[PDB]
Amino acid sequence: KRITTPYMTKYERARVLGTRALQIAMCAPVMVELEGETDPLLIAMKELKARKIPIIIRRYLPDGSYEDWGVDELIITD
Amino acid sequence: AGILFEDIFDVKDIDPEGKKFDRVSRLHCESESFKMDLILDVNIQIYPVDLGDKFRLVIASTLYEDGTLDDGEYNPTDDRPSRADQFEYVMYGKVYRIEGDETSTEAATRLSAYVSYGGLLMRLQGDANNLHGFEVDSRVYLLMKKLA
Amino acid sequence: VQQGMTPSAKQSLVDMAPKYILEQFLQQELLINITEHELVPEHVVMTKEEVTELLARYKLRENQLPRIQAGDPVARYFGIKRGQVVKIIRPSETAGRYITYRLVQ
Amino acid sequence: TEGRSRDGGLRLGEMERDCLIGYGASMLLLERLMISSDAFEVDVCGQCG
Amino acid sequence: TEFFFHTMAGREGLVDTAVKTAETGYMQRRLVKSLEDLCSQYDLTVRSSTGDIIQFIYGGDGLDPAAMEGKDEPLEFKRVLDNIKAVFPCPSEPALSKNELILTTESIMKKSEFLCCQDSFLQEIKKFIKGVSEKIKKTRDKYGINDNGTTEPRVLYQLDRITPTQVEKFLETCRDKYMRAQMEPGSAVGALCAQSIGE
Ligand SMILES: [Zn+2]
């Protein structure tokens, strides 16, 4: 089971977009079709809107145990 | 007919608080046959009104007296016959608040409806029976004509 | 005590015997019971099992809790010894209540 | 460098340092204060530290 | 002579602005320094670097000051109920009465998802619903309204209109607004405090 909040905190969104933009900057394969945009951050934002990013968050509770959430099952909000 | 309410009124007072604007007046009116009381604002640059006038007003669901309810759009340059032909001053507005006359603890049978004509307010108050059909968010036309 | 007590007995008042202990209050303090004062939230002492369950809930080590001094007027009122735990029920600004725990050191 | 006769570049004074902590960002203040100010590399011997 | 006295008063403003410069900055620098370490853990506690517990739940509620609509409260009920009524006028559904409103509200709140929410908020909502329910009672009483819906001058049913669809929407909107108004774990709770008091 999982106890933490089910929404995506702004910090998680920021670090996910950052690390995915960096991965697409180097020639990684892109998981969504692009219409001709040539800016990594906007491609990563579109991917997240399509919810296809291959990144798994690992939330460390203070004691040392952890919980894993796929970036597709957090409730993304505004 | 699409008429919601019709009556003859007479004007009683104009600016209980004195002049406020250069083109609008806050009429206080009373009804001849029924005992409705009315508060209305008119653009007195185009339809000047004197302290003693008498007039008939009709609040209608639609201007097409034949009963057509095609309210999709309104075209100012129309020419076909319409209920506007029989009046001298026409406005368009929306009923945006209905409330009871709380002043009466018992025999509460008087209501008040507010109609807002895109800034120009109006309130019509009195017995409940004559107010049948007024509904929040309904859009209605107001027509008026002076009488000798 | 009415007004005070002699310094040599001040020193003696810590080492009479391990099996015997004594507690001194001022007449001036006792004149009012702080428990009834408006600015003192209710304190409650609990058994060792309660603290066991609490430390199990938050996954804490005992020395992580907030502290309360031994010489604190309320601590003296309750006569509690070092190493015990105290629950507090702060009266909220509204009907709610907040629970917090403090350790006596 | 500092001046305008000499070349410049402005200061990230300590008030800004708190501002950047405040939002909760972490790479931004690392970048502003280490990558693009005095980035440098050294070596150390783990046995003697 | 008036001009001279006027100048005497005026210069005090200029002097004050000059004096302000240093002391306030020193205070802020000390304060942010003292507080900077704290953070809001994923457990809803707030802990210093050592890992000790400062607050068991940030602020007692867990809410976030930067996300408040009312006066230091997450919500302003009457404003929300008013908004939902205007956005969803339901001319089809029949007007509800005291017993119907209380019955239908209890049934909806019975769902487990609302049970997951905070208790205090649920109580306050119940209180608000009781309040409106007693108010509609007075209104339906004074005018001799009949609960069966058969009163002739149907305009009288506009007085305190409320319908089951609107009730359900309101409760969902309330729950969501409360839920999304929490201090997101990982926020730098200390720096926000030092900055807010210093300013
Ligand atoms: Zn070495």
From Swiss-Prot, chain B:
It is found in: Nucleus; Nucleus, Nucleolus. Residues 15-39 are annotated as: Non-specific ssDNA binding. Pfam families: RNA_pol_Rpb8. The modification N-acetylalanine is found at A1. Keywords: Acetylation, DNA-binding, DNA-directed RNA polymerase, Nucleus, Transcription. Its main location: nucleus. GO terms for cellular component: cytosol; nucleoplasm; nucleus; protein-DNA complex; RNA polymerase I complex; RNA polymerase II, core complex; RNA polymerase III complex. SMART domains: RPOL8c. One of its GO terms (molecular function) is single-stranded DNA binding. InterPro entries: NA-bd_OB-fold, RPABC3. GO terms for biological process: transcription by RNA polymerase II. Component of the RNA polymerase I (Pol I), RNA polymerase II (Pol II) and RNA polymerase III (Pol III) complexes consisting of at least 13, 12 and 17 subunits, respectively. Pol I complex consists of a ten-subunit catalytic core composed of POLR1A/RPA1, POLR1B/RPA2, POLR1C/RPAC1, POLR1D/RPAC2, POLR1H/RPA12, POLR2E/RPABC1, POLR2F/RPABC2, POLR2H/RPABC3, POLR2K/RPABC4 and POLR2L/RPABC5; a mobile stalk subunit POLR1F/RPA43 protruding from the core and additional subunits homologous to general transcription factors POLR1E/RPA49 and POLR1G/RPA34. Belongs to the eukaryotic RPB8 RNA polymerase subunit family. PANTHER family: DNA-DIRECTED RNA POLYMERASES I, II, AND III SUBUNIT RPABC3. This is DNA-directed RNA polymerases I, II, and III subunit RPABC3. The lineage of its organism: Eukaryota, Metazoa, Chordata, Craniata, Vertebrata.
From Swiss-Prot, chain C:
GO terms for biological process: protein stabilization; transcription by RNA polymerase II; transcription elongation by RNA polymerase I; tRNA transcription by RNA polymerase III. It comes from the Eukaryota. Keywords: Acetylation, DNA-directed RNA polymerase, Host-virus interaction, Isopeptide bond, Nucleus, Transcription, Ubl conjugation. One of its GO terms (cellular component) is cytosol. The keyword S-adenosyl-L-methionine does not apply. It is found in: Nucleus; Nucleus, Nucleolus. GO terms for molecular function: DNA binding; DNA-directed RNA polymerase activity. The keyword Cell inner membrane does not apply. DNA-dependent RNA polymerase catalyzes the transcription of DNA into RNA using the four ribonucleoside triphosphates as substrates. Common component of RNA polymerases I, II and III which synthesize ribosomal RNA precursors, mRNA precursors and many functional non-coding RNAs, and small RNAs, such as 5S rRNA and tRNAs, respectively. Pol II is the central component of the basal RNA polymerase II transcription machinery. Pols are composed of mobile elements that move relative to each other. Belongs to the archaeal Rpo5/eukaryotic RPB5 RNA polymerase subunit family. This is DNA-directed RNA polymerases I, II, and III subunit RPABC1. It comes from Homo sapiens. The lineage of its organism: Eukaryota, Metazoa, Chordata, Craniata, Vertebrata.
UniProtKB/Swiss-Prot annotation, chain D:
Zn(2+) binds at C45, C48. Disulfide bonds: none annotated. DNA template strand binds at R4, S5, R11. Signal peptide: none annotated. It is found in: Nucleus; Cytoplasm, Cytosol. Transmembrane segments: none annotated. Component of the RNA polymerase III (Pol III) complex consisting of 17 subunits: a ten-subunit catalytic core composed of POLR3A/RPC1, POLR3B/RPC2, POLR1C/RPAC1, POLR1D/RPAC2, POLR3K/RPC10, POLR2E/RPABC1, POLR2F/RPABC2, POLR2H/RPABC3, POLR2K/RPABC4 and POLR2L/RPABC5; a mobile stalk composed of two subunits POLR3H/RPC8 and CRCP/RPC9, protruding from the core and functioning primarily in transcription initiation; and additional subunits homologous to general transcription factors of the RNA polymerase II machinery, POLR3C/RPC3-POLR3F/RPC6-POLR3G/RPC7 heterotrimer required for transcription initiation and POLR3D/RPC4-POLR3E/RPC5 heterodimer involved in both transcription initiation and termination. Belongs to the RNA polymerase beta chain family. It is linked to Leukodystrophy, hypomyelinating, 8, with or without oligodontia and/or hypogonadotropic hypogonadism: An autosomal recessive neurodegenerative disorder characterized by early childhood onset of cerebellar ataxia and mild intellectual disabilities associated with diffuse hypomyelination apparent on brain MRI. Variable features include oligodontia and/or hypogonadotropic hypogonadism. This is DNA-directed RNA polymerase III subunit RPC2. The gene is POLR3B.
From Swiss-Prot, chain E:
It is found in: Nucleus; Cytoplasm, Cytosol. Expressed in the brain, in the cortex and the white matter (at protein level). Residues 1-40 are annotated as: Bridging helix. Belongs to the RNA polymerase beta' chain family. Catalytic core component of RNA polymerase III (Pol III), a DNA-dependent RNA polymerase which synthesizes small non-coding RNAs using the four ribonucleoside triphosphates as substrates. Synthesizes 5S rRNA, snRNAs, tRNAs and miRNAs from at least 500 distinct genomic loci. Pol III-mediated transcription cycle proceeds through transcription initiation, transcription elongation and transcription termination stages. During transcription initiation, Pol III is recruited to DNA promoters type I, II or III with the help of general transcription factors and other specific initiation factors. It is linked to Leukodystrophy, hypomyelinating, 7, with or without oligodontia and/or hypogonadotropic hypogonadism: An autosomal recessive neurodegenerative disorder characterized by childhood onset of progressive motor decline manifest as spasticity, ataxia, tremor, and cerebellar signs, as well as mild cognitive regression. Other features may include hypodontia or oligodontia and hypogonadotropic hypogonadism. There is considerable inter- and intrafamilial variability. It comes from Homo sapiens. The gene is POLR3A.
